[PDB]
Write a protein that binds this ligand. Structure first.
Ligand SMILES: c1ccc2c3c([nH]c2c1)-c1[nH]ncc1CCC3
Length: 299
């Protein structure tokens, strides 16, 4: 990424946003390498409105390598470009007179895994008696709609020759009108169950062993992501130990059972996504045609 990305231009006319129109609020997310802060921005989309945005910036004590890392990330977001189902770039603050700030879309409801897990007592397959009374309930239509949407996002990312490498519900963000968007260690005193997840549980067999990521290894990940959705945000492979024999059994053909809320065709889609042979897994385009039909047949 480095060196290469320094040789990509930055068009300030179309991306640069003045820092004096950005008012920062509370942090949304921390990391060992940086932070996303919630902020108010005036006129970020040219209209005369104050809009809530998310700001990636460096932590206090961040190095030169971490500045390069954020600037690469900015140029990759410029490269990737706009889609409804990715966390889109809105602007950047790069000139002298303040900190480096990369401004992206705010998704107010947070990640899809925590959201879904918080709706297990507000779920019905189809809305039976008067549909007014099941207001705010999740339904099969929602879950298949979240699915289709992520498949669109990934089809788009594939067409920009991008690879996600960590496709999971934690990295899916939910904004208003049920629109979902793809994005890419806290002190143990304040850690609760569910705070974390083991990323090996989303890795294709060829990535576990051969450590190669390709768009078809993302299709396997999409499969596990489907399972998260239709279990309403459970962790994959419940109570299973992720050791050398688990990895052995994966390659042999062992697979997760159906989660509690799946349709039979949605479980069949997980299994096709989990084909041992990468080239026999469906493409994200094929997943888009297929989930769109499932979504339409749910009627
Ligand atoms: C509630 C809890 C966390 C978040 C996060 C976002 N929005 C939230 C709402 C967000 N929106 N856009 C980018 C990001 C990343 C930071 C994580």
């Amino acid at each position: 990424l480095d060196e290469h990305c320094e040789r990509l231009p930055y068009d300030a006319s179309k991306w640069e946003f003045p820092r004096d129109r950005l008012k920062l609020g509370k942090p949304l997310g921390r990391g060992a390498f940086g932070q996303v802060i919630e902020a108010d921005a005036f006129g970020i989309d040219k209209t005369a409105t104050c809009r809530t945005v998310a700001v990636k910036m460096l932590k206090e004590g961040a190095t030169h390598s971490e500045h390069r890392a954020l600037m690469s990330e900015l140029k990759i977001l410029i490269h990737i470009g706009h889609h409804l189902n990715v966390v889109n770039l809105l602007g950047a603050c790069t000139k002298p007179g303040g900190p480096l700030m990369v401004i992206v879309e705010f998704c107010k409801f947070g990640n899809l895994s925590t959201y879904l897990r918080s709706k297990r007592n507000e779920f019905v397959p189809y809305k039976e008696a008067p549909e007014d009374l099941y207001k705010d309930f999740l339904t099969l239509e929602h879950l298949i709609c979240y699915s289709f949407q992520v498949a669109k996002g990934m089809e788009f990312l594939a067409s920009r020759k991008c690879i996600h490498r960590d496709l999971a519900a934690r990295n899916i963000l939910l904004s208003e009108k049920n629109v979902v968007k793809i994005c890419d260690y806290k002190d143990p005193d304040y850690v609760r169950k569910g705070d974390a997840r083991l990323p090996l549980k989303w890795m294709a067999p060829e990535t576990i062993f051969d450590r190669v990521y390709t768009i078809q290894s993302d299709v396997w990940s999409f499969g596990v992501l489907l399972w998260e959705i239709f279990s309403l945000g459970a962790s994959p492979y419940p109570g299973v130990k992720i050791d050398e024999e688990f990895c052995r059994r994966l390659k042999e053909g062992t697979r997760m059972r159906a989660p509690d809320y799946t349709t039979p065709e949605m479980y069949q889609t997980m299994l096709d996504c989990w084909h041992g042979e990468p080239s026999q897994r469906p493409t994200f385009s094929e997943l888009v045609e297929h989930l769109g039909n499932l979504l339409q047949a749910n009627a």
